[PDB]
Design a protein around this ligand. Structure first.
Ligand SMILES: Cc1cc2nc3c(=O)[nH]c(=O)nc-3n(C[C@H](O)[C@H](O)[C@H](O)COP(=O)(O)OP(=O)(O)OC[C@H]3O[C@@H](n4cnc5c(N)ncnc54)[C@H](O)[C@@H]3O)c2cc1C
Ligand SMILES: Cc1cc2nc3c(=O)[nH]c(=O)nc-3n(C[C@H](O)[C@H](O)[C@H](O)COP(=O)(O)OP(=O)(O)OC[C@H]3O[C@@H](n4cnc5c(N)ncnc54)[C@H](O)[C@@H]3O)c2cc1C
Lengths: 499, 497
């Protein structure tokens, strides 16, 4: 009865719908499990009505990013602000030493650059001769270049370089070394309302096309051409083509028994083996976010980028200087609990410099992410956990210890002191319709397989879109956006040609 | 009559020395190294200045230390004897504008960040691309600015282009003469400042029979005897005959061979003449002019925040307006037309603050063509050199919390005691710094022709005869090992039954 049925109203599904309408196609649907559109793009509201992108926040690769360029044109035409370039010189903070960024003797940034070059050479033309973890690679580097590194460099470098965990959403001992380093095609552009992006695209097509709260439970290849879709609530539909944009992790459920899993779609016939095997090449990371809202800014706005390094030790240096080899290094490193805010690196965006708002947008990674999200309702504990790093940051930015005012008590004493008024946490790892952040590589994974299998589709009528179905912008908002235009345009041309 | 030798190496630069070292290493005897100058090392030369202070006036750093084979060797030696042979002197650069002062690591200008974007821009422009026309590095920067103007601030559009030019000092060419395709490139790790490149030269020179070395013999001609031999004539009249010859003279010098007039210093008359493949490659590759000037002071009385300092050439706000008002590339190329002499603010200058990295109170400054040629042409007029650089020197002292320099060439003020200048564009056995690319050049051409040789017996080595480490000291070193190894392989067949 419908030309195209799109499953999922994230940026992937919405752009497709937008594209179809744009190409004169009608009788199309967008079945979304949630009670809202946007998918992993969600802008929440907190203290005094401030807004934040608890999901995607930045426009990456602004040199080639087509979605960004589109937003740029709009802004060029109407003069409105839709984004701000917030790249800045990073401020790195160690609990004991304080700031270690741009240091005349540590020069951590410089050796960090050699490290990435080292990673580049390590995997160059060799099909990744036996892959390891990002952790293993950093150790190999330290062992190989010890002769050219000071004691402090061997101590802090490995902790500084782990900011990359916040790009992938995985601890360095879980991250694939081969995929760790990547090149960004230009500066990043912090979106000032990714919801504005969602809204514009969402409005692009006939509203009656949208069907919220439709959890698709099964897709069947109607042995007669058309495809049939059923939403948990009973309703059944049928269309010429279907575009499945559910996240990789959710789609991965289809290869298990008992369609009992929330979100799991029942494919009939099942998804061909080329697809099933693709999932063996790992994926899904866990990038999390915690927003810290203060009454107002009373600290230095030198930079909008800040990272706290996990604790490190001088004994680590000694072990590195003494290891006779890689094996001896591993064993020696083996030193036999309890996680704290100083157990992993943490990335903070000081929103005051870039947007004027007195709040910090912090990024976290697996395994910390699921732990912090698990206790997202317990603000008291959340504060206790991050208080020590929140205090060190304020001390390094010419201010003082944070005052807990989540349960306010107006006091004049808190004149020039930072007053925390609210904490917000993401929930992606616990949300069944997302089950994590976005595709990521565990040592031994090959991302290309999924892209190929996905972009090829189950068959002529069952296509796939989403951040896990494309090479350029993979795992990125613009990637999904473009993958959405891809499927739409393809079906759009086929329909126009039919006669 | 003419002495019979197995292998004759022309030139005692690093290429030639490594060639000889390798031959000996492989047990080859009765060889010879003929060098025109009265010293070995070639473009590797360490001079002495004020109070016995030493400076490399030619090569100074070990580049690409992650894979540089020469550096790895030097490092192995220091690991076993504890002697210091080099020092990793990379640092955060200090950028200075004449009117504005320091503009580095600036929280509002964020020049370094857009510079990274610029390079990525260049990378995407070429690389992995076929049929892409090259242009000047300058034009490339103009294209970036026009294309990203919507995301650049006025001050960024004004200063970024001037900071981007630090790259001129890596090529020894002004941004309008530099091939954009070759501007950017990969650095395999940090750089290590040699604490005596001459120290590297000596070790290699001493690793083979000392009676092999014949300095002060300028070779005038090389002839292949159709009888399977090569005759080599020195200017002093001595004649030699050898089975193989490895020619390592500079590309600019070898170039003289393809021209009439045999009375030019360094020129070698080839018979038969150099094959057309080689001759024509001289059209697709050029020679840059990286130059040096050492400013020696009594003592340090300035900040040692960094060992790397760069002064940007003057810029104007009118430039900005033009980038803002341009309608397209052509439009911009047009408007950029103005109706006067060169000064120290007319181009970027790179200074190495040796006081931090070596503890010596001096500045090692690098300059590029066309400035290099003009500065070397007046290197004997110290007073004139000082007047020319005084303003950038003062501006620097100001930014490093000090005061105007005092001419002391004849309490807390910087006193200039001596000035040393390079001479590579004038030395007939050098005629420039090293191989460089003009827009449209194809260096692969010369490399291929050189590495293939004139014929089985007449081979070539040098910084211009190899891809990996092209233009670098370790590239010349490897090219030397390459030719020696090939020859050893061939002479190996002599002992088969
Ligand atoms: C914390 C975080 C930060 C990020 N930051 C950035 C960033 O700064 N820049 C960037 O470029 N990218 C970022 N990303 C990635 C980016 O958000 C995603 O790549 C992109 O949003 C994926 O889009 P999508 O349209 O494929 O799916 P959307 O989630 O991403 O999901 C597709 C839709 O399918 C629906 N669905 C699932 N199961 C069913 C079912 N059974 N029936 C019906 N509907 C179903 C979902 O509810 C959803 O609406 C971030 C991701 C996270 C988690
Ligand atoms: C100012 C400057 C700075 C530099 N800095 C660096 C740096 O930091 N790092 C780096 O890696 N590289 C640097 N280089 C480049 C490096 O010095 C060269 O790549 C390398 O020294 C070239 O070695 P070569 O053995 O091929 O030739 P050498 O000049 O380079 O020359 C070979 C020899 O041939 C001799 N010769 C010439 N004609 C005749 C003849 N007719 N008869 C007999 N002998 C003859 C010469 O006198 C010479 O000794 C720099 C170069 C310059 C000019």
């Amino acid at each position: 009865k419908k030309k195209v049925i799109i499953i999922g109203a994230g940026i992937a599904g919405l752009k497709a719908a937008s594209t179809l309408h744009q190409n004169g196609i009608q009788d199309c649907l967008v079945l979304e499990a949630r009670d809202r559109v946007g998918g992993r793009l969600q802008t929440v509201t907190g203290y005094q009505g401030r807004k934040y992108d608890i999901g995607a926040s930045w426009h990456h690769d602004t040199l080639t990013n087509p979605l960004f360029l589109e937003e740029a044109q709009l802004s060029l035409n109407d003069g409105r602000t839709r984004f701000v370039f917030d790249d800045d010189n990073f401020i790195y903070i160690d609990e004991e030493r304080g700031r270690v960024d741009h240091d005349k003797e540590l020069l951590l940034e410089i050796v960090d650059n050699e490290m990435s070059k080292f990673a580049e050479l390590e995997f160059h033309q060799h099909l990744g001769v036996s892959d390891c973890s990002f952790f293993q690679l950093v150790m190999k580097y330290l062992l190989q270049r010890r002769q050219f590194l000071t004691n402090d460099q061997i101590r802090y470098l490995p902790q500084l370089c782990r900011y990359l965990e916040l790009w992938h959403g995985l601890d360095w001992k879980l991250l694939s070394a081969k995929d760790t380093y990547f090149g960004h095609q230009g500066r990043n552009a912090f979106a000032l309302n990714y919801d504005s992006v969602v809204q514009r695209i969402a409005q692009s097509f006939p509203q009656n096309w949208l069907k919220l709260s439709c959890e698709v439970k099964s897709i069947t290849r109607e042995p007669s051409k058309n495809v049939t879709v059923n939403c948990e609530d009973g309703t059944v539909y049928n269309a010429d083509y279907v575009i499945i944009t559910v996240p990789q992790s959710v789609l991965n459920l289809s290869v298990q028994p008992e369609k009992n899993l929330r979100g799991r779609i029942e494919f009939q016939p099942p998804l061909k083996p080329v697809i099933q095997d693709a999932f063996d090449k790992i994926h899904f990371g866990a990038l999390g976010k915690v927003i810290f809202e203060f009454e107002e800014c009373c600290w230095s706005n030198e930079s909008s980028k800040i990272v706290t390094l996990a604790n490190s030790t001088n004994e680590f240096v000694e072990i590195v200087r003494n290891a006779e080899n890689l094996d001896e290094l591993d064993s020696m490193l083996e030193r036999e609990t309890s996680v704290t805010c100083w157990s992993q690196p943490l990335f903070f965006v000081n929103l005051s410099k870039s947007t004027g708002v007195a709040s910090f947008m912090m990024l976290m990674q697996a395994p910390l992410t699921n732990h912090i999200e698990s206790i997202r309702e317990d603000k008291e504990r959340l504060f206790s956990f991050f208080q020590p790093v929140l205090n060190k940051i304020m001390k390094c930015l010419d201010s003082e210890d944070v005052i807990d005012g989540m349960r306010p008590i107006e006091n004049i004493a808190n004149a020039n002191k930072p007053v925390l008024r609210n904490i917000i946490v993401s929930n992606w790892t616990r949300d069944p319709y997302s089950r994590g952040a976005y595709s990521a590589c565990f040592p031994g994974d090959d991302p290309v397989d999924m892209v190929v299998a996905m972009s090829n589709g189950q068959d002529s009528r069952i296509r796939f879109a989403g951040e896990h179905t494309i090479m350029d912008g993979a795992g990125c908002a613009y990637g999904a956006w473009e993958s959405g235009r891809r499927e739409a345009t393809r079906i759009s041309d086929l329909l126009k040609l039919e006669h």
